[PDB]
Amino acid sequence: REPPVAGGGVPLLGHGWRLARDPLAFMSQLRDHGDVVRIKLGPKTVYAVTNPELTGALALNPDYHIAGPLWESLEGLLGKEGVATANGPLHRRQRRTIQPAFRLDAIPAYGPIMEEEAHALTERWQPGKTVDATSESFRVAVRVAARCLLRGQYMDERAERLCVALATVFRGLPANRRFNDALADLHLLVDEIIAERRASGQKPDDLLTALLEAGEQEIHDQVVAILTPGSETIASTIMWLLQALADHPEHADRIRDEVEAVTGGRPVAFEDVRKLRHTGNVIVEAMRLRPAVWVLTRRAVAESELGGYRIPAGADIIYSPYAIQRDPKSYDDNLEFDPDRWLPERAANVPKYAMKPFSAGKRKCPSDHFSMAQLTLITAALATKYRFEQVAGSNDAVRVGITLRPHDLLVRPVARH
């Protein structure tokens, strides 16, 4: 048993500084300091795990509750700020309720709405007019998510707006003015929306009905908790996908050939996605280099041992899938965009947990199936009808926030055939 090694920072704010000047680099640097190192952001210490294996151990071990200190500092506030009181403490139990709505079985029924949201974009974006990625990706997001996870009365541009005016408050404890007119409205709306399905919610397999079949304000809190993160994430995701279709014409058109073969001409549909291999490979390779979620935290319940190191109980640990997915030691062409490094042969070349956009423990992403489905749909629909090109002056330099998104990605759909 050996306690972790330290890294290197300043007085009152140890690593709290290097991290400040550039988080993403600090996560990657930390990789060589030891399999698990200790770092100090000011007075308190956290532990970082920089090895795929230990990070998988880390997720697959039920001994790590997720108060995760530089997450629950906001989650204690998310107890008013967002989600509401908590988020998956223990028991879970009253939380398997969610699985039935996100399983591989309940996604093909969302398929139509998914197809519909995609092709719609397709007529929405027209060649020549640059697409505003931040405002627009954030939209198909809401729409898809809300529209499949709830059905009937449309929250259309109303839900979007609020979350928008919302998401922007985070970048640059809670806030000042219009973030207000958006919040109450976000809650005003979610409630109003629970009230309505109460009418005739028969077959609705979505999350709302299953959530109406398991607390009074506990439902108004679990939707606002599932809909919130999952949207900004499927969004940031979309964003990097746009940069992808615009940055590697090759695969973009390659993605258009794959779609035509299988689809023939008919607009892409859930059945097809399950066929479009290259379409998903693109989506994955992109998510590896530019994930939306780049750090993940936990809070040990019991004094642990990891990679032979002693993890003090009650401790607070942190890891970076960002870094992991971009670790040389884990990948050959470390920074090379290559949708084909996911080819069966090279695929096994890559460590077990060196690529898991979502995680493995019960703190996993219920929409793994749900996401890739709408993303693959959305990737295929766009690449097929267009070809994306990035407006000069476009700013695709990363902005490190809740998730990793492009400060100002500007692209123009061009007409393909």
* Binding-site string for ligand EL3 from residue 212 to residue 251, where x marks contact by CB under 6 A and - marks none: -----------------x---x------------------
d(CA 153, CA 147): 9
39, 234, 241, 269: which one binds ligand HEM (CB under 6 A): 234
Contact status: 326 vs ligand HEM (CB under 6 A): no
Q: Shortest approach of ligand HEM to residue 165 CB, angstroms? A: 19
241, 242, 262, 295: which one binds ligand EL3 (CB under 6 A): 295
Contact status: 284 vs ligand HEM (CB under 6 A): no
Task: Name the segment binding ligand EL3 (CB under 6 A); options: 145-153, 209-217, 290-298, 303-311.
Answer: 290-298
Q: Find which of ligand EL3, ligand HEM, none residue 70 binds, CB within 5 to 8 Å per kind.
A: ligand EL3
Nearest to 290, CA basis, from 329, 347, 233, 252:
233
Q: Shortest approach of ligand HEM to residue 11 CB, angstroms? A: 31
Cα angle for residues 165, 168, 169 (degrees, 5° grid): 90
d(CA 270, CA 110): 9
Nearest to 374, CA basis, from 235, 209, 204:
235
76, 402, 408, 416: which one binds ligand EL3 (CB under 6 A): 402
Question: Would you give the end-to-end CA distance of the chain in angstroms?
Answer: 64
Residue 41 in contact with residue 16, Cβ under 8 Å?
A: yes
Q: Shortest approach of ligand EL3 to residue 83 CB, angstroms? A: 6
Q: Shortest approach of ligand HEM to residue 80 CB, angstroms? A: 18
d(CA 310, CA 256): 51
Residue 127 in contact with residue 414, Cβ under 8 Å?
A: yes
Q: Is 12 helix (H, G, I), strand (E, B) or coil?
A: coil
Helices 178-197 + 156-171 axis angle, to 10 = 140
Contact status: 56 vs ligand HEM (CB under 6 A): no
Nearest to 15, CA basis, from 25, 187, 129:
25
Contact status: 366 vs ligand HEM (CB under 6 A): yes
Distances (CA, A) of 208 to 202, 204, 311: 11, 8, 39
Nearest to 158, CA basis, from 124, 182, 180:
182
Q: Find which of ligand HEM, ligand EL3, none residue 403 binds, CB within 5 to 8 Å per kind.
A: ligand EL3
- Residues of 102-123 as b/e, b for ≥16 C-beta within 10 angstroms? beeebbeebbebbbebbbebbe
Contact status: 325 vs ligand HEM (CB under 6 A): no
d(CA 70, CA 234): 22
Q: Shortest approach of ligand EL3 to residue 19 CB, angstroms? A: 7
Total site size for ligand EL3, rule CB under 6 A: 11
Residue 309 in contact with residue 367, Cβ under 8 Å?
A: no
Contact status: 66 vs ligand EL3 (CB under 6 A): no
Q: Shortest approach of ligand HEM to residue 225 CB, angstroms? A: 6
* Binding-site string for ligand HEM from residue 133 to residue 172, where x marks contact by CB under 6 A and - marks none: ------------x---------------------------
**Widest CA span in the chain:** 64
Q: Shortest approach of ligand EL3 to residue 70 CB, angstroms? A: 3
Q: Shortest approach of ligand EL3 to residue 403 CB, angstroms? A: 5
Task: Name the segment binding ligand EL3 (CB under 6 A); options: 105-113, 151-159, 195-203, 396-404.
Answer: 396-404
182, 226, 255, 317: which one binds ligand HEM (CB under 6 A): 226
Task: Name the segment binding ligand EL3 (CB under 6 A); options: 152-160, 180-188, 289-297, 319-327.
Answer: 289-297
Contacts with ligand HEM in 333-362 (CB under 6 A)? 357-359
To the question of whether residue 365 is assigned a binding role by annotation, the answer is yes
Contacts of 138 (CB under 8 A, 6+ apart): 160, 163, 164, 167, 231, 232, 235
- Which parts of this chain interact with ligand EL3 (CB under 6 A)? 23, 70, 229, 233, 293, 295, 297, 400-403
Pick out the residues of the known binding site for heme.
Answer: 365
- Which parts of this chain interact with ligand HEM (CB under 6 A)? 59, 66, 87-88, 145, 226-227, 229-231, 233-234, 237, 292-293, 296, 357-359, 363, 365-367, 370-371
